[PDB]
Design a protein around this ligand. Structure first.
Ligand SMILES: [Cu+2]
Ligand SMILES: [Cu+2]
Ligand SMILES: [Ho]
Ligand SMILES: [Ho]
Ligand SMILES: [Ho]
Lengths: 391, 136
């Protein structure tokens, strides 16, 4: 056998803490400063370092290299690690989101030790409570101008954070872009030519941010109704979990709604030919820092559906496309491996092990009022909440 | 809403199996009975298990270097290693052996003029008779 992975997925130790709504998160100066600082560290790391931003984003699609393996394969199937169009879409991405979260959290830990003000203890406590925030793309408070993302995520070239001696400073915004160093050699097309990640490109290959924002606001009432249908009309894992063997046939799935969200950021639908940026392209999406806010919400919506539909989990499905860790033609189940994620016991993670998200050290503020309550009570309450929040 | 399973192919030919110690897994282009060409491949311990939907037989390591369909599952002869060959979408189905090195599915006639069935020989990385494709 021998050791398999150099960076086990273990999640976050200590008390369970919430992943916050990005709108709330940015208002907390301690969480926001630590996130920006932690993100600076990750992004500045050598791109061959497996704990780097580049490598973490690298797992999802390109480059088609093994991640954090102590021993290479003899013949590597060069493909995405991510699983899409399969019963394992939700659970693989839960594991992926926690791999990121733990790496960010470890970085935030070292950062907090550098504060030298009289409130340093508060900075230290903040770092261990820190979790990855979510963009609730399905919420629309009947306000045409409402945007679910703050300027710190989508507009500001520089952001105000608190420096270690307690002083106010501006820094280049690590959330707005990732600057490659260098661009991945195996990127082709526009991606070979783009130095940073790019959102909502135009014909000239430049970012059209206001076009993107206009499109989000316009789509938002459509997304309320669609999210609600996705949460409340799916009763089985098959219809909920993935977009179908013909991509589109499961129109109401979590995956399909999630697909459209990628295109809101990554791809202007009016352009002809289409010109997607990183978020509009599966092999490149994970390099954009907003990928993690998007996926934090996909995991939240999963957590909400699971609560209403308790003990309705992964059902057997076919694997049609070979992915770096999955055999083409094999049957997929709750005991199928989720490469490249390993436990500290050097076993592969299974959907099995992460049905209970609290096992990875997080929850969502939605579940605060139902702590310690019965499955049935939790299901009722959350069903009322979903009707209030997305109805 | 039942699973289609997969075809196991070598070139244009596909793996078939019929009922009845152990029956031959025949690679050709004529399906003998309903779903005799369809296989359920599952994760099993550190490897895979390979079940024929038509015959209800498991593919197993058999007496004297052959691969046969048997009706009762045996963890010691029915667990397989499936490894990527290095080109296209072709893999090797391999006998599980500690620190690697096991024999692999090798599709060839018993003598001459057929029929073409599965044997277990040493891996030749350049041999076409050992390259497997799956299609759902
Ligand atoms: Cu993905
Ligand atoms: Cu995604
Ligand atoms: Ho606590
Ligand atoms: Ho499991
Ligand atoms: Ho299970």
């Amino acid at each position: 056998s021998d050791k398999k992975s150099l960076m086990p997925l273990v999640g976050i130790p200590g008390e369970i803490k919430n992943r916050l709504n990005i709108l709330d998160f940015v208002k907390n100066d301690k969480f926001f400063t630590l996130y920006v600082r932690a993100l600076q560290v990750l992004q500045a790391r050598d791109q061959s370092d497996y704990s780097s931003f580049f490598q973490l984003g690298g797992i999802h699609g390109l480059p088609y290299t093994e991640w954090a393996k102590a021993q290479p394969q003899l013949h590597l199937y060069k493909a995405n690690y991510c699983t899409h169009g399969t019963v394992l879409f939700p659970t693989w991405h839960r594991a992926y989101e926690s791999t990121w979260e733990q790496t960010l959290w470890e970085a935030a830990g070292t950062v907090a030790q550098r504060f030298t003000t009289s409130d340093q203890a508060e900075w230290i406590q903040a770092a261990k409570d820190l979790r990855q925030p979510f963009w609730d793309w399905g919420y629309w408070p009947n306000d045409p101008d409402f945007i679910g993302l703050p300027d710190q995520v989508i507009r500001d070239k520089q952001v105000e954070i608190t420096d270690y001696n307690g002083t106010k400073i501006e820094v280049e915004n690590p959330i707005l872009h990732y600057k490659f160093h260098p661009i991945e050699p195996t990127f082709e097309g526009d991606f070979a030519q783009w130095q940073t990640t790019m959102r909502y490109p135009d014909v000239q290959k430049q970012e059209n941010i206001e076009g993107m924002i206009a499109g989000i606001k316009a789509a938002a009432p459509g997304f309320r109704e669609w999210t609600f249908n996705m949460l409340t009309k799916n009763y089985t894992w098959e219809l909920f979990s993935n977009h179908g063997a013909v991509v589109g046939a499961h129109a109401n799935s979590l995956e399909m709604v999630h697909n459209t969200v990628h295109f809101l950021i990554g791809r202007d639908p009016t352009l002809d030919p289409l010109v997607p940026g990183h978020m509009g392209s599966v092999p490149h999406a994970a390099f954009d820092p907003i990928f993690w806010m998007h996926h934090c919400n996909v995991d939240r919506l999963l957590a909400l559906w699971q609560t209403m539909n308790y003990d309705v989990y992964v059902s057997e499905g076919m694997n049609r496309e070979a992915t770096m860790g999955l055999i083409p033609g094999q049957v997929l189940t709750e005991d199928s491996p989720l490469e490249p994620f390993y436990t500290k016991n050097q076993d592969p993670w299974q959907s099995d092990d992460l049905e209970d998200w609290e096992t990875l050290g997080f929850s969502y503020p939605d579940f605060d009022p139902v702590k310690g309550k019965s499955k049935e009570e939790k299901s009722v309450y959350i069903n009322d909440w979903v009707h209030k929040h997305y109805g | 809403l039942d699973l289609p399973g997969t075809r196991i192919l070598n070139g244009a030919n596909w793996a078939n199996n019929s009922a009845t110690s152990g029956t031959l897994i025949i690679f050709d282009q004529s399906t003998p009975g309903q779903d005799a060409d369809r296989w359920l491949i599952h994760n099993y311990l550190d490897g895979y298990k390979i079940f024929n939907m038509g015959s209800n037989n498991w593919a197993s390591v058999s007496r004297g270097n052959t691969v046969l369909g048997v009706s009762e599952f045996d963890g010691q002869t029915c667990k397989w290693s499936i490894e990527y060959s290095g080109n296209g979408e072709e893999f090797w189905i391999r006998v599980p052996r500690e620190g690697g090195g096991g024999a692999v599915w090798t599709i060839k006639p018993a003598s001459s003029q057929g029929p073409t069935t599965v044997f277990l020989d040493l891996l030749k990385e350049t041999d076409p008779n050992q390259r497997i494709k799956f299609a759902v």
